[PDB]
Subunit: 466 residues, 4 copies
């Protein structure tokens, strides 16, 4: 009847959520449809007024929401603060950008001979809401993935059924209360909690669901997307990354090693755009690896509520097990695994780990490692840096470190990624800008402007003047 939510730090019970049946989730979708009929009939200015009010509340509750993220998600408080502050600015940017993002066209159809009589026509476009959006959240950004999916949906007039990860659902429940305090109709966003195997399918198959937006793994996402699309439903998918960091021989080693450490091990490596594969020109390999090792041993692994904590635990036992499979696989294939930093024995603390002499047939170079394992590969050439970088089924983001920007811009043309970052982190994202990638990183882009267009239908009106 309820599910217990435990801190991955100390396994203490943080709160509980309803264990929903298929039937109760069917009811939440029918209620979200009525919420669509309400919110879609409100003028845009009242909807953006609600979004600006949510923005201000999120700033006022920053510290409370950050502590909650630290407890359920194991995200160090300093990183938890940043996520809540991004969600605040995202809700505001959705308010601010709606007028221009949703703006239609008056087409110059007299430019075209077909159909005949275009000189007597007015043809305009508008962006219409789709209806009910199913939003399936990842565990790792429970407040900011909420904002990415819900802020745009409200701006355009859609309702949302939100299914947070059962690992981190309490954030989503507190976000709903903030939406109601901001003046959002109770029916316009419905939180559903439960096990994926009981409530997953109804959220994807119900005839009243117009669209499914999902952040999660490639395996889980592509199956769900396939089902959604089979019933004529629209899909936005932000799936895995194995983002490479390329360090060229003319790199600033101090900067590149500092940013690599932070990019790989922030939130114990549980980022879609963490620096997951490190590719270093042989000329600087030993200097880079020594600087990297020093910086990883200097991090504080411990309680995420502590101000001095750099790194917390991974989310659960399932993740610990997957990460051990990965370290075993790598030792069994000639990899040099080194444990660099160990946290308390209280929960799901995973040792900050380095793999040297990795090979392309290892789990650490061919799958998404959502944990604090840094594989570092030596290369001889830019060409070999490019091939190893592209050698994954992923294509989210990639970083190049070089004092030679002309050279980095030329390598960037040959990297198959949705973003290339020159002299900065794979972790960089702008919540208003396109985010996403090529290949199996997902489908569409997610960001306030692109999400609003992906969440609306273009509608033309053509008048023939008589």
């Amino acid at each position: 009847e309820v599910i217990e939510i435990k801190s991955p730090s100390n396994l203490k019970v943080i709160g509980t959520v309803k264990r929903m049946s298929k039937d109760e989730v069917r009811g939440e979708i029918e209620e979200a449809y009525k919420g669509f009929e309400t919110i879609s009939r409100m003028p845009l200015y009242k909807r953006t007024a609600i979004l600006r009010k949510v923005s201000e509340i999120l700033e006022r509750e920053q510290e409370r929401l950050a502590r909650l993220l630290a407890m359920e998600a194991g995200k160090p408080i300093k990183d938890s603060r940043v996520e809540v502050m991004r969600a605040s600015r995202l809700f505001r940017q959705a308010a601010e950008e709606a007028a221009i993002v949703l703006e239609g066209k008056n087409y110059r159809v007299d430019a075209y001979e077909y159909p005949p009589g275009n000189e007597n026509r007015i043809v305009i476009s508008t962006r219409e809401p789709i209806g009910v959006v199913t939003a399936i959240l990842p565990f790792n950004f429970p407040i900011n993935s909420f904002a990415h999916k819900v802020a745009p949906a409200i701006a355009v007039g859609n309702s949302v059924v939100v299914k947070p990860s059962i690992s981190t659902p309490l954030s989503a429940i507190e976000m709903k209360k903030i939406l109601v305090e901001a003046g959002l109709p109770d029916s316009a966003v419905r939180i559903v909690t439960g096990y994926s195997n009981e409530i997953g399918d109804e959220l994807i198959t119900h005839p009243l669901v117009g669209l499914i937006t999902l952040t999660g793994s490639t395996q889980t996402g592509l199956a769900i997307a396939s089902k959604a699309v089979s019933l004529g439903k629209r899909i936005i998918m932000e799936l895995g990354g194995s983002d490479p960091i390329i360090v060229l021989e003319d790199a600033n080693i101090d900067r590149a090693s500092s940013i690599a450490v932070r990019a790989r091990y922030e939130y114990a490596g549980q980022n879609c755009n963490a620096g997951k594969r490190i590719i270093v020109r042989e000329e600087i390999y030993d200097k880079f690896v020594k600087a990297f090792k020093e910086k990883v041993k200097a991090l504080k692994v411990g309680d995420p509520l502590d101000e001095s904590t750099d790194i917390g635990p991974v989310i659960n036992q399932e993740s610990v097990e997957k990460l051990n499979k990965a370290l075993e696989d790598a030792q069994s294939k000639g990899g040099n695994v080194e444990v660099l930093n160990k946290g308390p024995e209280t929960g799901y603390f995973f040792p900050l780990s380095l793999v040297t002499n990795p090979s392309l047939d290892m789990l650490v170079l061919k799958t998404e490692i959502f944990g604090p394992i840094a594989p570092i590969v030596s290369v001889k050439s830019d060409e070999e840096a490019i091939n190893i970088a592209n050698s994954t089924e992923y294509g989210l983001q990639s970083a190049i470190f070089s004092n030679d920007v002309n050279r980095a811009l030329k390598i960037a043309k040959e990297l198959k990624f949705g973003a290339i970052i020159i002299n900065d982190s794979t972790r960089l994202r702008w919540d208003s800008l396109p985010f996403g990638g090529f290949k199996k990183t997902g489908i569409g882009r997610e960001g306030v402007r692109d999400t609003m267009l992906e969440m609306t239908e273009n509608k033309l009106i053509a008048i023939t003047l008589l």
Copy 2:
């Protein structure tokens, strides 16, 4: 081994095409991948010079391509000429608009606090080709659906594997020779012919296929889309419609009935945006229905190659049987089926037919009728017009006839369609503008501008200036 192509007018043999095996189609996708590697490395001005040359060749070969359409597709020569002129114009519009449509951004990232240090960044976007496109064409616009899929793909640097309908593949083989004459590398577009059930699956599941664009039936499309998306491939779908024409009591009756007749019966009704359901205000019902019948009986049904033919045959026996079943279903459910006009008995001529007293349980009101059957419904109010109009699983285009545009524009707001046409045909399309709609009418939009965006990936480059 070959497949015989027969005219639906007189059943005579027009030509043959290779019955390709799975292994031969595998070869074509491999060669198309080499075509991608070639075409993607040419500068855009060279690709656009190829597209302007195709445009000029299409204009020069117009009468020869029009006659071939008439013979394989049964499309009257007058409508065949219009189709080849549209494809001419589309190839040119892809050349002309590519510079502006593919234009990227220089983002004002210094407007945003996150990530910190945006005042020191340049973030630019470019549109990158996806790679190999699988284009699955419908029978009803063999040349213009070719143009809609191939011209944007060449503009953006994708290669294409083209599977025409086995009913109308001869057009596509003639389009390939025109591409080669225009200077396109032979590897850059590959025509596959054969049975949908022997070569369909390779074209959807081959690892080298990045995207599937398809025009066809809802059931066919959604199954293909489902499979493609399960493998991480992008999809553009233009599936059916059941476009309603709403005729209000204050319409111009002569104009509304003339356009409603052309809208339903053009190409024997085989158009995604045919006027498939006609909703008439009871005040003018008798006058409209009477004007409608006189004009249907004035249409000439006959041989597509005769200059005085208005209406040719339907495409094959399978269609005749689907269309009898819709007629029989209407008779049995209280519908009055009246035949108005009958062409020769020599192939797949289907009588131009009218159904009065239809009901929402009938096939002629709840499915796409891809043939010359016009159901006419009487309504008392605009509210009733809107509820019948919206009652389908489709959402392509709708028309409203009314001398009152103010009322037409308010009704427009409540119609769930990709386009609403005020005082003109459901048939209207602007080949550069979005075409498509809501619900199971498809995924995405198809037009020179929209197809180019859907056929490219956004790629960010972010420089942090040191």
Copy 3:
């Protein structure tokens, strides 16, 4: 040494401002240049944070600023409230729209064969601030014209020297204090007060002034613009209107007469887009004129601080004199002048007045009447409605009243105005949208989006990759 500001309602002294010398204004411009060096180096996000803070303060001070407008400008409190609330929303829209409005391009220069080698180039654009803006305000919107000129200038990084009308300078002084409270650097906006004949020229000719934005009369504006442009300075000019209201025989007479009364006599007619010339089809002339007369006699002319006041005085004796010249001119040429409504004898109350049988050689039909004089012209045809409407050197906005929107859209193609309003007021303006006109209405457009582009220089950066 000081200039006294008097209420046009009761001539009571409301406040005083410095009588500035050429020398002191030279000093204000040199200080605004230093303000440019400061504000242009602040990141955009801090500038938009200042603009959002100004937005909130203007809401908090709405009633105080509205009373001040009522006292110095003679604007009834209810209209004064609306102006302050528009200035609030304008300062916010400038904050909200900057990121997207200022966004540059990444040009697809490989679309072009010239110059040769475009396949090896990156070409981007950015919007740069111009430097120091001279802003010359009208008397009639002292707070909202302030916002139109200052909010965009701050968003883009320009400094502003603001010269309010000597009729209404106290508003501008209170706006500066609100800018400082919001965190704007003291040097970034300088208020100058004085007589045009002492300080006018320095504000237009100083070498440090990059741009002049002016709302005012055509005669004053075109002289200033000529001087600015002679020294290579940019210009935005919002000058006069004589906006026509066209009432067709199928108009809603009740609505058209109500909106005409309000459009002509709001703020005693002192609006650039007041309904200044009324054009009525003869078939409804007597019904319209009787409805108009009734509604004008029912208005309350009196103290603008009173809640029940509809109409206040004109601004000064100079205006009273110009309006008498106009009424004398019209009586002397066969016009039927009728006084409909008289206010107190305390100040510059001008009688609400109607002229019937006007002719095209009268001041009331050929010049801007910035006072409560309504000329009404009878016409026989749409063609005569169009010729009389276009028969002025102005082209700001024009309104058509008709239940036939198809007909009004066709008349709209032949009206030489920057905006045509169908079934609504000439007074309509959207502060984010283009506002302005053809002919001698001015130069450029004024609105948050267009003003930001007019206040920035496009800058290209072209990199040839080596």
Copy 4:
């Protein structure tokens, strides 16, 4: 009465043109107004078909038009061919881009509270032609400045009165016959020839002239602009530049000196964006200056019609005298004037000359030198490079040579220019892209896209739905 056109190469008579009176130019503006009334009523697809035909004729007549440019303008045939190909491409780009550039908006007015009732409004924008354009052409690009002014004007529906430079009017008379051959009405473009001081003022002040677009000198332009704006006419101005080339210590010296030579001396230096001031880092000064001199002495100065000529004459005696005065001024102020290369003594050949040890008081550093005189300055730092670069009243384009793009991009931020070129020539222009700059370099931008917007008026239509 006629004016003799003489070749600046050998002073021989190339042709004659009418010496038009004020009364004859009055007639031409009247006929152009009738041309506006005709061309503005044609649908856009017809006007664009005329522009694509002009493009094809220019390509066919390329060698004949190139030879005429060589003879009247003294422009070497190799550079003349490039000019006629650019104009060919520009006419085509005006045809191709008109549909998207002129596209209006459907504003989301329901995002705004003011005016009340925006939820019931449709507000659309269109681009309307202004009417008659006066195009005043410079001598140095007689055919491409024609294209830049006439092709956008025809695309948007304006008529044009074209006053070519009396030095190079024969090209424009040949362009008119091509327009007529393309199908343009004869009334739609009117060539005026005569003395600037007899017909200049009618072309600027006639009441039927809506806009003046001019390429020429700063002093000429600003006086004309001043007059036009005093009468309420719109203005586009492209006036001088003194583009600096900055060459950093880590530049490719061979490339920087080759491009710097071409940049300064192409067409004897008579380009708005010539490399007019060359700023070299003291570390490479001696090596650059030496490579520079060898390449200048390798250039062939001679007859424009010879295929091996690199550099022809300057345009007339007035130019030779302006250029001697700049030389004499430099000698007297401590400058070392070295002649490097001398063409024939047969017309207006001017020696290719170099000035070392220049000073900021010299004409060769504070004015536009429209001839083959290259001042080279030594600098110690980037800070000094930037201050010299920015020291002019001009702001057209600047170039930076550097293998370090990161440093090139940071310097780019501090240069006050309309475009900065990294590792390429100041000569670069993209005829579709903005061209122009800051300060007294002009008003507005000139390119297919920008010129079309500057040559149209925004017109809003706002419907309130009853």
